[PDB]
Amino acid sequence: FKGLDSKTFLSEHSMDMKFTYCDDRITELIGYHPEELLGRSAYEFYHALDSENMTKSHQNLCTKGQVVSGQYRMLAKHGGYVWLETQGTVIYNPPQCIMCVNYVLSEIE
Amino acid sequence: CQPTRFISRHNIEGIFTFVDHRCVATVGYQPQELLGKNIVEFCHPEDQQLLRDSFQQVVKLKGQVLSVMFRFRSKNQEWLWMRTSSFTFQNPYSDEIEYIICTNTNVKNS
Ligand SMILES: O=S(=O)(c1ccc(Oc2cc(F)cc(Cl)c2)c(Br)c1CO)C(F)F
């Protein structure tokens, strides 16, 4: 059994969805080292069956400014998938970046 | 009976910078659904590194054709086998960075 903080991690993305920062907690949970994620779009990692739903959730984030993703799968580093729910927030300036608070719903499947 | 195919241009990173409207019949997406995205985003997880390595090599091959087969996720969320044939173009009157031209055909894996 894991405590809430240990299943949560933050990530930051450019408006093109590429990772620009990820907390080190992701490593224990999904296998990735943060620096290997950098410069790759979120889209590289969604299961095929979640892809279209994520595109619609992204539109909503861009029109509303904040969105909760609802349940999706991230490809894990050594294959299989982990279920996540994310709260996304756009940071706008003087859009600049997207901040994601990511909560793991499952082990690697 | 024609194969179903469409042309695209990419930057050296893999991002679609041009997409021929024959894509709608080939894979189901409007060109604007592909433009600005990296081709690897449409690629099966088992094939994504081969596709990244292929974009990386085609620029070393002196403008000659490099082919790759990979599973592409159609607009219906289904994996379609694609054979992408790619080569670089650089206009010798200039020193602008080369880009990659691809022809993308749905093929059988058998
Ligand atoms: O909730 S969103 O704002 C969103 C969700 C995830 C997102 O990125 C991640 C972050 C991760 F840690 C892992 C994976 Cl597979 C994707 C992103 Br970017 C968004 C914003 O669209 C919306 F698009 F779902």
The full DSSP string for chain A is: ---GGGGEEEEEE-TT-BEEEE-TTHHHHH---HHHHBT-BGGGTB-TTTHHHHHHHHHHHHHHSEEE--SEEEE-TTSSEEEEEEEEEEE-----EEEEEEEE-S---
User: Cα(B109)–Cα(B73) distance, rounded to whole angstroms?
Assistant: 15
> Do A68 and A58 touch, CB atoms closer than 8 A?
no
User: CA-CA distances (angstroms) from residue B73 to A19, B26, B106?
Assistant: 22, 11, 11
Backbone angles phi, psi at A64, to 5 degrees: -90, -30
- How far apart are the CA of A71 and the nearest CA of chain B, in angstroms? 17
- Scanning chain B, the segments in alpha helix (DSSP H) are 23-27, 31-34, 48-58
Minimum CA–CA partner of B38 in chain A: A41
Does A11 contact ligand 1 (Cβ within 6 A)? yes
CA A60 to chain CA centroid, nearest Å: 16
Handedness of CA A98, B36, B40, A43 (dihedral sign): positive
- In this structure, CATH architecture of domain B4-110: 2-Layer Sandwich (3.30)
Q: Residue A54: which CATH number? A: 3.30.450.20
Resolution stated for this PDB structure, in Å: 1.6
Does A99 contact ligand 1 (Cβ within 6 A)? no
User: Cα(B70)–Cα(A45) distance, rounded to whole angstroms?
Assistant: 16
Q: What order of strands is seen across the sheet that includes strand B79-89?
A: B16-19, B5-10, B99-106, B79-89, B66-73
User: Cα(A28)–Cα(B21) distance, rounded to whole angstroms?
Assistant: 43
Contact with chain A for residue B30, Cβ under 8 A: no
User: Cα(B33)–Cα(B11) distance, rounded to whole angstroms?
Assistant: 17
User: Cα(A1)–Cα(B20) distance, rounded to whole angstroms?
Assistant: 51
CB neighbour burial string for A46-83, b if at least 16 within 10 angstroms, e if fewer: bbbebbebbeebbeebeeeeebebeebbbbbbeeebbb
* Domain range annotation of chain B: 4-110
Tell me if residue B69 falls in helix, strand or coil: strand
Neighbours of A37 (CB within 10 A): 21
Overall number of domains in chain A: 1
DSSP assignment letter at B39: G
Strand-strand pairing, B5-10 and A81-91 = unpaired
Nearest to B66 by CA among B91, B97, B88, B38: B88
CB neighbour burial string for A95-108, b if at least 16 within 10 angstroms, e if fewer: eebbbbebebeeee
User: CA-CA distances (angstroms) from residue A104 to A27, A54, A64, B21?
Assistant: 12, 16, 24, 39
Provide the β-strand partners of residue B38: B15
Query: What range defines the domain where residue A96 resides?
Result: 1-109
